[PDB]
């Protein structure tokens, strides 16, 4: 069982987009103060996953990489690899050299 992967189970409010919460403060579900101890109505918000190789496909671990592409008024520098047609000489051709 691989318990090195954690997920937040409780928070008071929903996250904003692209927000990271790494706080390890006890979630208060009740009126009583938690006082930093996990008792009644007070739970630790981070819970461990229990990945095993004999699990179902809906419970097996999936590595997710999300790529976010934004355009800002600064000059865009992460460009794709523009393909290059072999050079042909001595013929009337339409040339496109660096734009």
């Amino acid at each position: 069982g691989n318990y090195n992967y954690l997920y937040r189970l409780f928070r008071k409010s929903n996250l904003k987009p692209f927000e990271r919460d790494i706080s390890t403060e006890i979630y208060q579900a009740g009126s009583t103060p938690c006082n930093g101890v996990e008792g009644f109505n007070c739970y630790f918000p981070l819970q461990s996953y229990g990945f095993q190789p004999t699990y179902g496909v809906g419970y097996q671990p999936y590595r997710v990489v999300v790529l976010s592409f934004e355009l800002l008024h600064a000059p865009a520098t992460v460009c794709g690899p523009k393909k290059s047609t072999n050079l042909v000489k001595n013929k009337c051709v339409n040339f496109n050299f660096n734009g």
Partner: protein
Amino acid sequence: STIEEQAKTFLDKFNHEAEDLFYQSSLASWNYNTNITEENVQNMNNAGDKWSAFLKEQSTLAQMYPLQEIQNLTVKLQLQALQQNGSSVLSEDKSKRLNTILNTMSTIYSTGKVCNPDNPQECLLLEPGLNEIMANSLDYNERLWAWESWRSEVGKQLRPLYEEYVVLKNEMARANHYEDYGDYWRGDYEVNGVDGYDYSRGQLIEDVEHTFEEIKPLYEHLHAYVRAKLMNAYPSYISPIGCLPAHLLGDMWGRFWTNLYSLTVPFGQKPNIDVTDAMVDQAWDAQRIFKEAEKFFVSVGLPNMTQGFWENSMLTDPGNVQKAVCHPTAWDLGKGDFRILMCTKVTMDDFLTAHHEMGHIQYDMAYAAQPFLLRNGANEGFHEAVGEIMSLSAATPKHLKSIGLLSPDFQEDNETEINFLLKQALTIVGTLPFTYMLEKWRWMVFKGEIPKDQWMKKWWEMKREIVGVVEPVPHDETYCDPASLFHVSNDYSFIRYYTRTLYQFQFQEALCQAAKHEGPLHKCDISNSTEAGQKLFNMLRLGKSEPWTLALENVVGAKNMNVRPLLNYFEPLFTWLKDQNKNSFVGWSTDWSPYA
């Protein structure tokens, strides 16, 4: 903030941690079952103690949330399931005594070895030493010896233990605000809070009697026919007017009558529908058996088995070096892990058992979307009934012809249908009065209607009145004749088989009406019908989230368990038995006329 949101967060925490702990415990039980070794026993015991302590601590946390301030039905159902004390309400000394009594009954039943006096050098255990003798012998005094000696040893060991057991369980049940332990068992069918679909604990006994009153003519005719055939087999022991001798029913206790099919066959001259040789000739592996079962379940529209099922299940006996439990069991380990542990042979019985356990697996897969504490059947009857409907559908000659296991020029006349229906009645109909009599006797024992000095005088009186089975010799109160069976000695409910039997034919009529089958009910096959699978899966996906009455409305359109589908299933056989019982006398006498 509010109590309901607190309970919802607590239930989320419970579900999430309980699913992983239940996985660990179930995996330890699996590793014990596929590998019987002492360290696996120790790991199983450690995981079970951790699981039970976690359930105790979560029930202790759960009781602090009062029930009447929660309005959501599913949250209230999970909180009702969690807040049960169980044995925790009882004192620690009496709880330890009850646990010790249960464990020593388990050891007495499992390691009970009985053989003939004056020949003690080797002895035979119940499985398979005594089972084969009870199922295959034709000798009166040998079966009488085995039956009386095993009830002598087992009953004389278990009678004070059962006398302590009834008092401790009644004390725990009245400590849990129940009338008796029978009311605790009947509380599984209790539905509270749903408008119209409410079901009471006291309505269950009335419904069982009302259904059994319609069972009774068919069982009387079947008993008369079996009595006449056993009179032919044993000339002088059986009386025309009296009950059947107890040790002649083909099993150890009378649980099933399916081992009397050879003696009581109507048309022996006609052939059987045995497909064993056809699989042997085509070399059908157990993998092919499970793939054909999977083809059956995809034909009706249900989901196919996971990759982890095929990777992680043990569908063949491992060998001499590795020990495993031979009993077929479907395992819902949790977290989408579904396995079957079966020592599959090339027989019709193992093929039907494969369909039954894959039906169990389909039922377990269907409520995987539900929360953890709602991952069960709506009652105890549905879980077995959805496997028994697959056992019904797979056994049909149309299914065998469709998959190629039966010859396409096999003649399906009325005589083969009569003897097949008689075999299905000996398996299915014959267990119903025994089940009803056993549960009614246990309910009267827990309720205090029967005093401890009068348990057996009433019990045989019940067996003559209900089952139509007479004792060979009278038994005094030193015997404990009920507790020789596995379920009663190990604290298991027994009405699940009665409810399973009625729900089986109710589901069968509902799916055959969905599949637009136009013939007899026993000639019906639910393959190739997507709508029947959809109607099944609508109930299957609910799990324990909805009441069993509402689930039964979803399948059959009725709010209560019904007996008419069973009578419709066996109606050709019922008319044939009424024709065959013209000369003979239907019904029995409770007097000692055959033998006592």
